[PDB]
Design a protein around this ligand. Structure first.
Ligand SMILES: Cc1ccc(NC(=O)N[C@@H](C)CO)cc1F
Length: 165
């Protein structure tokens, strides 16, 4: 199971780890992808997860979009986890670098409540432009299921733990 995580609350855990390497190691039931509405996994966590699947995640995602159209900001879809997990929950957090409503971050985290346990990144953090301290606070105040957060950046991980209320 998950190892080396610092317990933040009853159900939220955090670790300074590469989510791709964490997924390959644990093979969780659900790995969360920091997706965009088009499921175009170009950069950040999405680009890294997709590259780990040898682009199989992108091929599956393009078929999903061709059939269903784009996701909503704050929404999600469950697709295969390929070589990383049983499932990948593609969750769209608001991208503040694309001028999207930061109030949609709570709606994005609510998708996690449909899964008993998840390996996840901080939504809207990194290249999505939101304050990761704010993302962690929304995560702890919204998610009720067991979430194991992987934070790639050591310096950000330290800042998140040291500032956690
Ligand atoms: C935000 C973020 C987090 C983790 C990674 N990790 C990654 O690409 N790891 C490779 C070496 C795994 O094969 C990239 C990212 F952009």
């Amino acid at each position: 199971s998950f190892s080396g995580y610092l317990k933040l609350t009853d159900n939220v855990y955090i670790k300074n780890a590469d989510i791709v390497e964490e997924a390959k190691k644990v093979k969780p039931t659900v790995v969360v992808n920091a997706a965009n509405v088009y499921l175009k996994h170009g950069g950040g966590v999405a680009g890294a997860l997709n590259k780990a699947t040898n682009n199989a995640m992108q091929v599956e995602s393009d078929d999903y979009i061709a059939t269903n159209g784009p996701l909503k900001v704050g929404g999600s879809c469950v697709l295969s986890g390929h070589n990383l997990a049983k499932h990948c929950l593609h969750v769209v957090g608001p991208n503040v670098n694309k001028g999207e409503d930061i109030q949609l971050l709570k709606s994005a985290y609510e998708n996690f409540n449909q899964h008993e346990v998840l390996l996840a990144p901080l939504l809207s953090a990194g290249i999505f432009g939101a304050d990761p301290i704010h993302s962690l606070r929304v995560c702890v105040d919204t998610v009720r299921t067991n979430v194991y957060l992987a934070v790639f950046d050591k310096n950000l991980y330290d800042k998140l733990v040291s500032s956690f209320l």
